[PDB]
Design a protein around this nucleic acid. Structure first.
Ligand SMILES: [Zn+2]
Ligand SMILES: [Zn+2]
Lengths: 113, 120, 95, 54, 72
RNA sequence: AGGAGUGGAGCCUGCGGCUUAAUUUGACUCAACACGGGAAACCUCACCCGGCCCGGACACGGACAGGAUUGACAGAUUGAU
RNA sequence: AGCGUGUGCCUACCCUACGCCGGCAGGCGCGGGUAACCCGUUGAACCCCAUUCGUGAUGGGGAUCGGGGAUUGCAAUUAUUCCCCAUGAACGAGGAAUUCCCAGUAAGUGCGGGUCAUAAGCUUGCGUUGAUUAAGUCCCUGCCCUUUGUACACACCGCCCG
């Protein structure tokens, strides 16, 4: 069964709000910036942005499979339809979502404000 | 004594779907939707208190929370005690209250007598 | 919780290494583990037992619980259910 | 205590719905299928796409 | 300091204890030296607990523990 | 300069006082008082009267398979299978 | 008329045309609509046109109450709402005091949304009918700038003298 056009665009929003808040709570101390969800007829692609991507995937892509197995099981839509990437933010000293988590990590490690 | 033009003795053997045509609309609808699982077990308790009561003696007081129990005409004479939030208050069922709820006989509040007004 | 609950919760932990929940004590049964009749309270308290030992890693969200598996938690499932290391979970499947 | 505790019929009414991120029951926006608190909607509004125009 | 012990704990709301006689199978079984198996209590005819799981024998009834079947 | 009024009346809803087992509570000039999106039958529920449950992780010592809790018909007890 | 809403992850919970039965509140089927496709030409209310009433606590006004009937719910008694009879109070344009407002405005008049199992005297939007007066001042209440008096500055709710 399909759904209304008014509901489909609002339920589309609450997906990317919970996804983004979950990934904030997860990778806030890994320099996470945002997500970018592109939907193909084959799959739904989720592009994670981060400062250092190569310390996010784990080793040879170990942490990326736990994340794409959680986000399949939470939002229910089946296997082989979701897949996570990890691209890098271009100018790290511009986006304020990387500069508040760097500043929190600087403060937590005992540095004067 | 009667009720809508029929004495209590025919009400004691008035059937379930025919007594419903004498009641008012809340009570008729309530008997249409059914008496639930914890309301059949109250009438059984009042039968068990009635046929073990002595023939010159009214039965002992029985404690309930069921303030929504309709006073059926097969429930006359019993000593039920319906709660008021604090205490179980003693109720004796008379035949003239056979369309009311049980929970309008334990008052739920202290009827107010005022004092001197303070700083208004 | 009985054996066919506490065992069956641990079975799908080794399969893919992650488990989600709802923080819903009052749920009749967990939706991933149908045909077993394990409530959500059972899997919730099982992972609450596993987190204090250090076998899983907790993360919360809006409403749902999330749990990953640490390296010393793989061996705790490897001997509790007696598996050989010749099989692998989903760690070393793609790339 | 099996036919008991989660026994009471929560099939409607104010305390069968709760916020989907707060799990709080007061000030709830059910319109368009949001089901958020009135406070947690205001945090995530620009993420959903509700822009304040006028 | 900065507290009072108050001695006001009243947990006296006694629960039960599981009174089991030593190897209650001897209450269940009785065997003579020829080798007869005299099951002194009834066996429940249910599908789940048939032919192995024994009932209770009260003062006026039979009684199960699995499906709590009752007789007279 | 005016218009509609409000303040008088009935009622609806807030807030004080009184009352109460409890009448949960925050807010007191504009910048508290149809405000808490607060139109509470139950739930909401905090408050009052009574009762059940652990949903007390984990670490340590005892009980410990002449056992540890568990579950359960009837009878009494109970608001209450 | 105009803004709108409509079958929902957990989640039960709807917008409803049309035929029949009912004074009516409603009840049965039977279709449409995940919507510029259906309710819907959204056949709104004041407004407009005819009959009756005739300055009186009247047919204005409807409070408060006695009987029934019907939906919602697990539950309607301390009345959930709704329908029908009956009862028919205060109130005769409001003291001291005080609020809002400059044009499609005030005011009237309905309609949607939120709340919503049940439900708007609230709020938030929308239309429809649609004016009087003003195009000015610092009198009041306040805000501000410049000169200027201060023995004030947890700052006139100040500091202080018998
Ligand atoms: Zn919330
Ligand atoms: Zn058995």
């Amino acid at each position: 069964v399909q759904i209304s056009k008014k509901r489909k665009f609002v339920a589309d929003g609450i997906f990317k709000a919970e996804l983004n808040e979950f990934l904030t709570r997860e990778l806030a101390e890994d320099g996470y910036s945002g997500v970018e969800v592109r939907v193909t007829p084959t799959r739904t692609e989720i592009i994670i942005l981060a400062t250092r991507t190569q310390n996010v995937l784990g080793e040879k892509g170990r942490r990326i499979r736990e994340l794409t197995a959680v986000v399949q099981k939470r939002f229910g839509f089946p296997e082989g339809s979701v897949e996570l990437y990890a691209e890098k933010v271009a100018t790290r000293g511009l986006c304020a979502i990387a500069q508040a988590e760097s500043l929190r990590y600087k403060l937590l490690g005992g540095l004067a404000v | 004594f009667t009720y809508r033009g029929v004495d209590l003795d025919q009400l004691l053997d008035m059937s379930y779907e025919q007594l419903m045509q004498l009641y008012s609309a809340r009570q008729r609808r309530r008997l249409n939707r059914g008496l639930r699982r914890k309301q059949h077990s109250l009438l059984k308790r009042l039968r068990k208190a009635k046929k073990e009561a002595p023939p010159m003696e009214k039965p002992e007081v029985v404690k309930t929370h069921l303030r929504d129990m309709i006073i059926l005409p097969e429930m006359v004479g019993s000593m039920v005690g319906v709660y008021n939030g604090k205490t179980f208050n003693q109720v004796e069922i008379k035949p003239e209250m056979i369309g009311h709820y049980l929970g309008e006989f334990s008052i739920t509040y202290k009827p107010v007598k005022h004092g001197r007004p303070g700083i208004g | 919780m009985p054996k066919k609950n506490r065992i069956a919760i641990y079975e799908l932990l080794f399969k893919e290494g992650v488990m989600v929940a709802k923080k819903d004590v009052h749920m009749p049964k967990h939706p991933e583990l149908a045909d077993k009749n394990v409530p959500n309270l059972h899997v919730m308290k099982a992972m609450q037992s596993l987190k204090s030992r250090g076998y899983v890693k907790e993360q919360f969200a809006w409403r749902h619980f999330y749990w990953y598996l640490t390296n010393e938690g793989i061996q705790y499932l490897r001997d509790y259910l007696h598996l050989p290391p010749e099989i692998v979970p989903a760690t070393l499947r793609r790339s | 205590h099996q036919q008991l505790y989660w026994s009471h019929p929560r099939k409607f009414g104010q305390g069968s719905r709760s916020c989907r991120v707060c799990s709080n029951r007061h000030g709830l926006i059910r319109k368009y299928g949001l089901n958020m608190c009135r406070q947690c909607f205001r945090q995530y509004a620009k993420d959903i796409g509700f822009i304040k125009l006028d | 300091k900065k507290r009072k012990k108050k001695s006001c704990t009243t947990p006296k709301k006694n629960k039960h204890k599981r009174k089991k006689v030593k190897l209650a199978v001897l209450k269940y079984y009785k065997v003579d030296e020829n080798g007869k198996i005299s099951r002194l209590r009834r066996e429940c005819p249910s599908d789940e607990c048939g032919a192995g799981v024994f009932m209770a024998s009260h003062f006026d009834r039979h009684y199960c523990g699995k499906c709590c079947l009752t007789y007279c």
